[PDB]
Chain A
């Protein structure tokens, strides 16, 4: 098929999680 319109803008919310965790890891490694 073709990827759903609602499907493309659903992976971005899931990507918000590794974004938060990479932010946390960066800030912790800066210490």
Chain B
């Protein structure tokens, strides 16, 4: 039900942004276990040691998101 621009909180526990806020970029069609693409402002940990930033996008499911605006 979530659309583009939906500010949402991540509930994946193991996620780096669990409790943080991210904006939805797109929702892939049915069939995929994690279609909700969420982009973030704070980069995560990904990258080899000493690298610059990290990854600021990940795919989740509807059940793993709490809706804000």
Q: Do chains A and B touch in the complex (CB under 8 A)?
A: no
B: which residues have CB within 8 A of A? none
